[PDB]
C-alpha cells in the first residue's frame, strides 16, 4: 500500500544498509541472506517492545535511564549512546561523500562541505520516490536466478567462523537493528514497512550475489563499482545513495537531539576521512559494527524495564534470547579483534 511502502523507504534510508548488503553478496553470496532475516525479526520485536513501552509509563528511554541508575553509569551510557549517534553521523557523512564523488566527482572533503551546506539547506515525496525507485530497481532482479538453488539452500543458518565472515554479518545485523529506533494502528504499519523492506534488503543482497560472485573483479566495497547494469541506472544508484544519506542525516541528528537534549560535535568523524592513510569505502562497514556494539546497551534497559510498572510485554521468549546471542556474536568478533 501507499503507507507502509513510503514508511519503509524512509525507514531504511541510510548508507550503511546499502554498503553491507552489497558486501555480503560479493564475498559470502547467498549464504549471508539469512542474517538479514534475523536482522528484521528481532528488530520487529524490539521496536514493538518500544511501542509496547513508549505509551505505558510514557517516556523515551533516555528519560528512563536517568530515573533509576547511578550517575557514573549515566555518564557511561551517554558515552555509549553519543558514540552511537556519532558513528551514525559518520555513516551519513561517509556515504554522502562517496555519493557526491559518485556524481560530480568532487573530493570527499568538498562533498562534506556540500553536506554541511545541505544541513544549512534543511532549515520528502521526491526522496521517497528515489529510494522507492531504486527499491523497485532491485526488484527488477529479485526474480533473476536460481530461486530454489542458491536462495533457500542458503537461508538456512551456516556456522561460519572466519573473522570477516562474522564481522560482515555483525555489520549487517548491527545496521538493521538501528539503536535510534529503540529510542522511541502503528504496529501494523511498521511490521509491514520493515516486512517489505526486508524484501528490499534480501533483494539487494541476492542481486549483489548474482551480479558478481565468482567473477572476481574489483570489490563491491567502494560503492563506486556498485552500479549494476540492467547508463542512467548508475546515476540513479548514486542519486539514491545521496538522498538516503541526506535524509538519514536529518533523521539521525534530530534523533541524536532527542537522546542528547534529554550539532557540530558529531562532525569530527565526518572529516576523519581526511586521514588519507586508509580509504573510506570499508570503514562504513566498521561504522556498522561499532554501531553494533552500542546495541546491547540499548537492549538491556528495555528487557529489564518491560516487566515492572506496565501491562503487556509479559512474553520474554525470543526477545531475551536475542540479546545473549547478539552479545556472544559481538564478543566473538570483539575477542578476535586483536
Amino acid at each position, epitope marked *: 500500500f501507499l503507507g507502509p511502502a513510503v514508511i519503509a523507504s524512509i525507514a531504511y534510508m541510510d548508507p550503511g544498509n546499502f554498503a553491507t548488503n552489497i558486501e555480503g553478496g560479493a564475498r559470502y553470496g547467498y549464504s549471508l541472506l539469512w542474517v538479514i532475516l534475523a536482522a528484521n525479526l528481532m528488530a520487529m520485536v524490539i521496536q514493538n517492545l518500544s511501542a509496547n513501552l513508549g505509551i505505558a509509563s510514557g517516556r523515551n528511554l533516555p528519560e528512563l535511564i536517568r530515573e533509576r541508575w547511578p550517575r557514573p553509569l549515566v555518564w557511561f551510557y551517554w558515552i555509549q549512546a553519543e558514540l552511537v549517534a556519532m558513528a551514525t553521523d559518520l555513516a551519513e557523512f561517509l556515504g554522502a561523500a562517496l555519493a557526491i564523488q559518485l556524481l560530480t566527482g568532487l573530493p570527499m572533503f568538498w562533498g562534506a562541505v556540500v553536506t554541511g551546506v545541505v544541513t544549512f539547506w534543511l532549515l520528502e515525496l521526491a526522496v521517497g520516490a528515489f529510494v522507492l525507485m531504486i527499491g523497485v530497481a532491485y526488484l527488477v532482479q529479485v526474480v533473476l536466478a536460481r530461486p530454489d538453488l542458491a536462495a533457500v539452500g542458503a537461508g538456512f543458518v551456516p556456522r561460519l567462523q572466519g573473522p570477516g565472515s562474522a564481522y560482515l554479518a555483525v555489520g549487517i545485523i548491527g545496521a538493521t537493528v538501528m539503536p535510534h529506533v529503540i529510542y522511541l494502528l502503528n504496529r501494523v504499519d511498521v511490521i509491514a514497512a520493515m516486512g517489505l523492506a526486508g524484501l528490499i534488503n534480501m533483494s539487494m543482497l541476492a542481486v549483489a550475489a548474482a551480479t558478481f560472485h565468482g567473477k572476481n573483479v574489483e570489490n563491491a566495497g567502494d560503492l563506486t563499482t556498485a552500479y549494476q*547494469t540492467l547508463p542512467a541506472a548508475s546515476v540513479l544508484f548514486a542519486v539514491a545513495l545521496l538522498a538516503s544519506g541526506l535524509s538519514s542525516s536529518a533523521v539521525g541528528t534530530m534523533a541524536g537531539d532527542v537522546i542528547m537534549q534529554g550539532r557540530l560535535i558529531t562532525m569530527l568523524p565526518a572529516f576523519i576521512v581526511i586521514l588519507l592513510g586508509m580509504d573510506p569505502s570499508s570503514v562504513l562497514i566498521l561504522s556498522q559494527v561499532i554501531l553494533c556494539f552500542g546495541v546491547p546497551f540499548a537492549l538491556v534497559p528495555l528487557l529489564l524495564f518491560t516487566a515492572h510498572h506496565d501491562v503487556m510485554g509479559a512474553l520474554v521468549t525470543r526477545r531475551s534470547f536475542t540479546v545473549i546471542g547478539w552479545v556472544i556474536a559481538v564478543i566473538i568478533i570483539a575477542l578476535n579483534g586483536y
Partner: antibody, heavy 114, light 108 residues
Framework: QVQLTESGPGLVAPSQSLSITCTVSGFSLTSYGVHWVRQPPGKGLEWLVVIWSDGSTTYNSALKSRLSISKDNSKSQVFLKMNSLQTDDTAMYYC????????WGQGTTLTVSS | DIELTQSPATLSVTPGDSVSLSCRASQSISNNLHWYQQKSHESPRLLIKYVSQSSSGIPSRFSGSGSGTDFTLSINSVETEDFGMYFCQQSNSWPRTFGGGTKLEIKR
C-alpha cells in the same frame, strides 16, 4: 610477479584415486576464488567447478558427486581430487585466479588406462 | 545451462586480413564474456574482459565488439603471432560456459 604452478603429470589405473596441487604465488589466495578448467587432448573445453576461498565448493551439474576440491591456506594450495570409478576421463587440468582472470597455471596432464 | 556456439570452427588467413570470431549465445548474457588466445600445449592468457574492455597486458591489435545475444572478437593484421586456438567464456550465471572454440591457421 604473480604466478600459479600445478602438480606433476599423473598416470592412474581405472577405479583409482588422484589429487593435483594448484599452488599459488604473488597474490592473496585467501582473497580470490579459484576456478578449474579441464581441456581434453584437443576436444574443446567446458567450465568445471569453482572453489571460493574458505572452502566454498560449487560443482557444475556435469561433474558433480565425483570430483572434490580441498584447500590448504597454510601453504596456499588448491587441491583437486578425483575418487570413485575413473572411467578414463583423460585430460590436462587448469586452475585460474585473479580479479579479471588471466593468471592460469601451466596445466597438468592426467591419463587413465589399465 | 546457457551455452555459446562459436563460429567459424576453424579459420584460415594469410596473415594480413582482419579476422572476426563470433560467439553466439543461447540467451542474453549482457556484456559478461571473456576472450582467450591459446597455443599448442600452452596456458591461455586472457585477452578480452566484458567484450568491450581490453584486458591487462594485451596488444591493441585485438578488439571485442558486441551487445546482447551475440558478440564478436576482431583481430586486425594477424601478425603471425595470433595463430592458434581462441576460446570464449560467459561468466554471468552458474555454470560458466566456454564457447565452441576456434583454431586460426595459416592460409596459402
Amino acid at each position: 610477479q604473480v604466478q600459479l604452478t600445478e602438480s606433476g603429470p599423473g598416470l592412474v589405473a581405472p577405479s583409482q584415486s588422484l589429487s593435483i596441487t594448484c599452488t599459488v604465488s604473488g597474490f592473496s589466495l585467501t582473497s580470490y576464488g579459484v576456478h578449474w578448467v579441464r581441456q581434453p587432448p584437443g576436444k574443446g573445453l567446458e567450465w568445471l567447478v569453482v572453489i571460493w576461498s574458505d572452502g566454498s565448493t560449487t560443482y557444475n551439474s556435469a561433474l558433480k558427486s565425483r570430483l572434490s576440491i580441498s584447500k590448504d591456506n597454510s601453504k596456499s594450495q588448491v587441491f583437486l581430487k578425483m575418487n570413485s570409478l575413473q572411467t578414463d576421463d583423460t585430460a590436462m587440468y587448469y586452475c585460474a585466479r585473479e580479479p579479471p582472470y588471466g593468471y592460469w597455471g601451466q596445466g597438468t596432464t592426467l591419463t587413465v588406462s589399465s | 545451462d546457457i551455452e555459446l556456439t562459436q563460429s567459424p570452427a576453424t579459420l584460415s588467413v594469410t596473415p594480413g586480413d582482419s579476422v572476426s570470431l563470433s560467439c553466439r549465445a543461447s540467451q542474453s548474457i549482457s556484456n559478461n564474456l571473456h576472450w582467450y588466445q591459446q597455443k599448442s600445449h600452452e596456458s591461455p592468457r586472457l585477452l578480452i574482459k566484458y567484450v568491450s574492455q581490453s584486458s591487462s597486458g594485451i596488444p591493441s591489435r585485438f578488439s571485442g565488439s558486441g551487445s546482447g545475444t551475440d558478440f564478436t572478437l576482431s583481430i586486425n593484421s594477424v601478425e603471425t603471432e595470433d595463430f592458434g586456438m581462441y576460446f570464449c567464456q560467459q561468466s554471468n550465471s552458474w555454470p560458466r560456459t566456454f564457447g565452441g572454440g576456434t583454431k586460426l591457421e595459416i592460409k596459402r
